[PDB]
Design a protein around this nucleic acid. Structure first.
Lengths: 107, 79, 98, 93, 99, 79, 107, 91
DNA sequence: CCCTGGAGAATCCCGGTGCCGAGGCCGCTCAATTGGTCGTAGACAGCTCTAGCACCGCTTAAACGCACGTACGCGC
């Protein structure tokens, strides 16, 4: 056959299109899975992954750290308003909460 | 195993409220917080018990705890 | 010779700041471990829990109680108070539907 | 031993493509793997949910497009739609 | 001569008992219906709504507002009050997670 | 269609409070209730818009609104 | 082709076992569906239907009505603690709420 | 066309427990939506339960586990016992 | 009673150790990739006909507004 070029490189993506397609078929969702559905799923997951990691990297530089540790991921999710509403019902382990103090609480 | 509801000590409940930004903690909060935690634990562990019973397993795994928390809108990341 | 004698509230706010930027687990391991086994033994005897299984339970319970305490504290200022009450928690659970 | 499916390395290349000077711990890696899987289950569950109501047997790109509009709110939705639309057009071409 | 002059709160309790046992919709159909159209105009210009479609939105909005008012009222007695306040709703949505 | 947020009249908001057991209704609660209702409607109707757009239909059905409310954990019985 | 006997009558139930089995097959839930799974599902649905209707019938006798109305169903669901917790996130149309007033509100 | 409904089966259940009262179509639609909503919740939990242990089938134990996960308290053990009785009567 | 200077203690910036978890490399093997082949769901075209949109009488219960005072939010 021809060269086994990955579908992620064909779509300009890093997330695995085939793994998403395989998990969609074995995940018991529909009788058939379309061709562009894993490509759309990979783009959405990668953009969500890249957005949080960039914000986590921004939070990592705020506390001068070169390694992403779970406090950075929790800080990135809660600081962003859209990530807060998307993950409102989501508990992040080893992350704590935002360090905010009530206005009337200060002396 | 008896009187294990007192394992969540008063400074531990004090420390938990400090993470939540609580200024002052009443003396009756610790008894109420223990009861709330006991009720919350009695739902998650019981749900995890059914998850463990369904798998023909005798030890509750971390994945079953995640599914027990996920079905009630309290999904947990990292396990 | 005069003792420092910190007024109430300032060290509590200091504990708030030192524990909001940190990520260590506030509840001890075995006291939370023994509480899980006692609760689980009422549902099924001869039951075991993995070390990471209790780890998932401990962080989720702390975050749920911290979020509950955040609503409990928010009820105090809403009620023109700085001290949380057991009735503040009861209002918090009722509004959340728990 | 047994091969377990995970997004451990895939998130790593995403991190280096946008931040080539920082790293990531394994605990943060497991959180990202859980975050990817949960969003995967929510969208695929929604896309399956959408197809059942329209009496449609297959899940297309429009199934995912509606699913991410329902879950992701506002400005986060349309960039994901724009990124999703760009990926399908690049894949077809 | 003087009228009956019910004390403030007496007619309020009668309205409470009447509307808690009757299932008639408090919000009028047409003013609520036009609110759906102007909200949906921002998402689609050429859009239509069925009579039952506006019907389903009205009951869900009424029940959500009634449930919100129940939590808003309970915060008032919690705050040593009997009058609902805008800060009580803001507390109610935040505790429920709806900002 | 403009100024339709005022269609939720003052007695209509008062009647909603009476169903919820509210005894006294403030004069500033009507703007807040209208804002809360507008935010709640801007989520469900927009969700139903995407449901209607995906269904290859140009009229919103009550069936689409049912799933729009259900996906946010507010499932409605009786359609 | 012998006598056609429904599985509901064999299991002592009124809910349709075959309809539940058919909906499970085309519902994209599992590759295979057991024989007792629709029987168990129908029995659970039958008990839940019978429990609500019994409480609705008891609620209907309270306001002197011989027909079940959506007010009766809402009253039946909310009065039962098990039904209220199960249907906590459920909105009932034309049901209203419970006729309860807080203690500080009465004169 | 033909539309699937749960209206008539509930009526036989209604006459079984309370033969002295009827039901309205407006209340029938509420009960039809109630049975359908529980149906997707139990089947969705059972489908999720089968996916957790890599199970390709849904049995009576799949429905039983979903009932105790969804139905809280003493309501669940009634449905478990009712399901067990129907399963034994089926065989 | 309020403004301002000095000092006690928890907290923050910084130099040195190192170590153990994170980053990089080798297979290689099993899941991702290539090509073909049909049953078949789906996009497309024409009919229609049942329900929604727009305007009209009307009338009437619902709603805006103003006068008054007493339960109550709020200040101390």
């Amino acid at each position: 056959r021809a060269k086994a070029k990955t579908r992620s490189s064909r779509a300009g993506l890093q997330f695995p299109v085939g793994r998403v397609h395989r998990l969609l078929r074995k995940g018991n969702y529909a009788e058939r899975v379309g061709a562009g559905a894993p490509v759309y799923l990979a783009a959405v997951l990668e953009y969500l992954t890249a957005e949080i990691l960039e914000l986590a990297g921004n939070a990592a530089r705020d506390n001068k750290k070169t390694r992403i540790i779970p406090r950075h991921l929790q800080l990135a999710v809660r600081n962003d308003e859209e990530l807060n509403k998307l993950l409102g019902r989501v508990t992040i382990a080893q992350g704590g909460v935002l360090p905010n103090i009530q206005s009337v609480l200060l002396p | 195993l008896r009187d294990n509801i007192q394992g969540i000590t008063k400074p531990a409940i004090r420390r938990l409220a400090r993470r939540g930004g609580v200024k002052r903690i009443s003396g009756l909060i610790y008894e109420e917080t223990r009861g709330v935690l006991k009720v919350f634990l009695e739902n998650v562990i019981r749900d995890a018990v059914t998850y463990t019973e369904h798998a023909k397993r005798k030890t509750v795994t971390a994945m079953d705890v995640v599914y027990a928390l996920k079905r009630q809108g309290r999904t947990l990341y990292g396990f | 010779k005069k003792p420092h004698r910190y007024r109430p509230g300032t060290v509590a706010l200091r504990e708030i700041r030192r524990y909001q930027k940190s990520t260590e687990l506030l509840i001890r391991k075995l006291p939370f471990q023994r509480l899980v086994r006692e609760i689980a033994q009422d549902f099924k005897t001869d039951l075991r829990f993995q070390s990471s299984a209790v780890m998932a339970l401990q962080e989720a319970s702390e975050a749920y109680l911290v979020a509950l305490f955040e609503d409990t504290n928010l009820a105090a200022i809403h009620a023109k108070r700085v001290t949380i009450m057991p009735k503040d928690i009861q209002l918090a659970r009722r509004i959340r539907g728990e | 031993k047994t091969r377990k499916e995970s997004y451990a390395i895939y998130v790593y290349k995403v991190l280096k493509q946008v931040h080539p000077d920082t790293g990531i711990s394994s605990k943060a890696m497991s959180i990202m793997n859980s975050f990817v899987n949960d969003v995967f289950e929510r969208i695929a569950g929604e896309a399956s949910r959408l197809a059942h109501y329209n009496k449609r047997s297959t899940i297309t790109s429009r199934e995912i497009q509606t699913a991410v509009r329902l879950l992701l709110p506002g400005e986060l939705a349309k960039h994901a739609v724009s990124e999703g639309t760009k990926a399908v057009t690049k894949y077809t071409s």
